[PDB]
């Protein structure tokens, strides 16, 4: 086509989706990770995660308001990945890298799994 | 903070939101523009438009499944702007620029209004 493109549009959209999440606006699901609860938008979770994409395209699970993750999933690891979904920024640290990588593998977030593998390999 | 950032994350999220729109997945509103109907995600419309942001933060309108736009709004102009919201690409042409600019002013999409003004000024 002969379209023009606004370079900062995708980033501006993601920034506004994060502002709606912070104010709890039109969030339609709560993700339960052991004792912790995280409110989010189903569309953003699906757009970022192979696991959520599979869950919310399922004809019965698409209508659930609560999703319980596997008890082995660490709440902090999940929180870090949820923040990444909404911002593009990943808070990766020596103290959380193992939990972040395990959570990213479970959530099927291949680019996160890739950087965790590379950061771990460099420390070996 | 000491975060790392994935450059293509926002673009990848927007691409997946557009794929969900194309397959009509988790769309929660229909925008009526005269005889034409457009299905979308309320969160994406709010993230892109000052008008939709105002509408869906309203305690009564946030729950509506149908929104009727002003009869002066051109369906093609709306379609072009909806495509822009979901892709960052604007199909701006001599034959549609007046309708696109009027629709962008109504929807409160200031960056679109700005490029339309500049493209019109250059032709004068």
């Amino acid at each position: 086509d002969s379209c023009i493109q606004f370079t900062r549009h995708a980033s501006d959209v993601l920034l506004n989706l994060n502002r709606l999440r912070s104010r709890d606006i039109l969030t339609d699901v709560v993700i339960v990770v052991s004792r912790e609860q995280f409110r989010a938008h189903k569309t953003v979770l699906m757009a970022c995660s192979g696991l959520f994409y599979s869950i919310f395209t399922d004809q019965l699970k698409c209508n659930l308001s609560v999703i319980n993750l596997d008890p082995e999933i660490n709440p902090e690891g999940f929180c870090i990945l949820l923040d990444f979904m909404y911002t593009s920024r990943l808070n990766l640290r020596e103290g959380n890298i193992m939990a972040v990588m395990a959570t990213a593998m479970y959530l099927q977030m291949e680019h996160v799994v890739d950087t965790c593998r590379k950061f771990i390999k460099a420390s070996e | 903070d000491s975060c790392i950032q994935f450059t293509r994350h926002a673009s990848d999220v927007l691409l997946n939101l557009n794929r969900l729109r194309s397959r009509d997945i988790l769309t929660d509103v229909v925008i009526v523009v005269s005889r034409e109907q457009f299905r979308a995600h309320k969160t994406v419309l709010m993230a892109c438009s000052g008008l939709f942001y105002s509408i869906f933060t309203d305690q009564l309108k946030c729950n509506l499944s149908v929104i009727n736009l002003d009869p002066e709004i051109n369906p093609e102009g709306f379609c072009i702007l909806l495509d822009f919201m979901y892709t960052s690409r604007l199909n701006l042409r001599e034959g549609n620029i007046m309708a696109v600019m009027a629709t962008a002013m109504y929807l409160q999409m200031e960056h679109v209004v700005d490029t339309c003004r500049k493209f019109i000024k250059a032709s004068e």
Binding site: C3, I4, Q5, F6, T7 | R89, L90, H111, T115
Partner: peptide, 4 residues
Amino acid sequence: WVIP
């Protein structure tokens, strides 16, 4: 704005 750019030519993509």
